Design a binder for this molecule. Structure first.
Ligand SMILES: *[C@@](O)(CO)[C@H](C[C@@H]1CCNC1=O)NC(=O)[C@@H](CC(C)C)NC(=O)c1cc2c(OC)cccc2[nH]1
Ligand SMILES: *[C@@](O)(CO)[C@H](C[C@@H]1CCNC1=O)NC(=O)[C@H](CC(C)C)NC(=O)c1cc2c(OC)cccc2[nH]1
Lengths: 305, 303
């Protein structure tokens, strides 16, 4: 038993982190087979970052301008290209530690593990959630750009995030492994503000199911509700609306506990309208929204990879 | 900026996780060099676990009784010894993925990272703290015995915990890599209780410093307190006393924020007596104590 913020093992992603340096600008890159993926602003200097033209700056660069380093071993760049805000560099060596992988664009609320890297050297690992406003409440310092977020399924590593920005409010923003930003942010040295955040309803419900599984079920009521009526009420409390995919992934926890998705919704809808009246769930009076139904299943069922 | 429960990368440890099987009992083992470490209750049957005479049960075992599997390969046990509750299995092959490692006994309040494994396969990683009562609030299911906790310094892995037991309260207990249990627990199949837990004060103060570094300052105040007067209130609320060493370890965080330790203590004392109202610190409604000054300094340096 026990419920904690659990991250996937990072062994597979560690062997793919490399250091990409252009001039004096250095960040982390992802070495998959014979291609290294990294943020494109590495070709930028301190001043160009203010207002850059990446297409203009890239034409002035050649393969020999890029320094790719695995440890202290250089990987000669034999080709370069730009896809959105991500830069792709072909190297002369196929990563012998390349795992079965895939590129995926996660959804708001979905969780992933972040491998904090600095100078191509992994330093820490932690789990985080893609907030409804397309930001992540992570932990990043200078030199963390290029750090990737991932999910481990079976033996495939599904890369879904590459770090780029830290907003003024302390949150962070990035793109997928195809250079496409999450949210309306841009890779420029500018103070950008994200939209108002909301509570991830699907995750709060998965937390409730985690409680019901652990004998804590006082919050269950004899009420039910429609998916539409619940979503309209949930928005009045800063709770993200539920989707078809949300109801589906809540199935396993629904069958295991025997409580229908729409029954738990009415139970959560009551917790929002009347409060908690003291008391707590899983020992905490604060509703947690950064545990997906999978995180509840994986951690309560010991799923390995 | 930002603060998050961060664990060390588990790559160097994943290459050492194997599966040990004896009869109908299976658990995880740690393969370092030509040796494999695992809990000794793997040699026990469902009946022996109730009251195991491990010395007796061990001598009645042979090398071929232990099935050590490393992925799709089986390791040949050419020897077996016992060091307290840890069973040392010698094999014919040396683990090439064996990193530079050391065996250390963690202290209460210190933190380490746990690599949860089931059947010799890593399932997840998280950071946890050795509670003052020598338990840990981890996440372990059946087949988790053999999982190890560790800290990494440069490229040297410091092993300090091997999982064994889940108390009836839902907490977890285990031993260091020398087989010595943390706390007054024994590896028998009995319901065991731990001593009354206390809060790691120095970790709470460090976590408050992390909150201030990240823009949270509502709990601060103008008052200041003496070390003794703070400890009097801390002990009253079941908080570990703050030592002059603890004050020194907090120095770097006090300089970065400009808030003196005894000034932070005044805030904590007020939080203990008045509560947190409906407010939160770093997204939490409870005073966190599973972050050491080092863990805070690592994430908040330069911010
Ligand atoms: C990468 O290391 C760049 O390689 C960092 C990541 C941040 C450093 C501290 N913590 C981080 O998460 N990214 C940057 O330094 C750039 C990214 C651009 C060039 C794509 N800048 C910012 O993140 C940035 C810029 C501003 C700003 O404009 C001056 C105002 C407020 C915040 C801010 N953040
Ligand atoms: C190992 O996986 C066994 O190989 C297992 C892991 C824990 C149980 C589920 N979660 C865990 O973290 N450990 C045990 O089952 C140990 C075995 C001992 C060391 C031989 N025992 C317990 O966890 C245990 C026994 C009892 C008990 O008695 C009977 C009464 C109440 C709780 C309890 N836990």
């Amino acid at each position: 038993s026990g419920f904690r913020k659990m991250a996937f093992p990072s062994g597979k992603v560690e062997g793919c982190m490399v250091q990409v340096t252009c001039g004096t600008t250095t960040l982390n890159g992802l070495w998959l087979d014979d291609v290294v993926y990294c943020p494109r602003h590495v070709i930028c200097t301190s001043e160009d970052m203010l207002n850059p033209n990446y297409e203009d700056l890239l034409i002035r660069k050649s393969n020999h301008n890029f320094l790719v380093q695995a440890g202290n071993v250089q990987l000669r760049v034999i080709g370069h290209s730009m896809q959105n805000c991500v830069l792709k560099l072909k190297v002369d060596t196929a990563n012998p530690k390349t795992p079965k992988y895939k590129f995926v664009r996660i959804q708001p609320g979905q969780t992933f593990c972040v491998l904090a890297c600095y100078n191509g050297s992994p330093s820490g690992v932690y789990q985080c959630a893609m907030r409804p406003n397309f930001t992540i409440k992570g932990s990043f310092l200078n030199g963390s750009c290029g750090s990737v977020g991932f999910n481990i399924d079976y033996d495939c590593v599904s890369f879904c995030y590459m770090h780029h920005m830290e907003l003024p409010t302390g949150v962070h923003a990035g793109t997928d492994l195809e250079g496409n930003f999450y949210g309306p942010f841009v890779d420029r040295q500018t103070a950008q503000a994200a939209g108002t955040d909301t509570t991830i309803t699907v995750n709060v419900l998965a937390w409730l199911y985690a409680a019901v599984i652990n004998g804590d079920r006082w919050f269950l009521n004899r009420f039910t509700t429609t998916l539409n009526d619940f979503n309209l009420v949930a928005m009045k409390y800063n709770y993200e609306p539920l989707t078809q995919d949300h109801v589906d992934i809540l199935g396993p926890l629904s069958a295991q506990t025997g409580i229908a998705v729409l029954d738990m919704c009415a139970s959560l809808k009551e917790l929002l309208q009347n409060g908690m009246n003291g008391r707590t769930i899983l020992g905490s009076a604060l509703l947690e929204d950064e545990f997906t139904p999978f995180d509840v299943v994986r951690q309560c069922s010991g799923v390995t990879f």
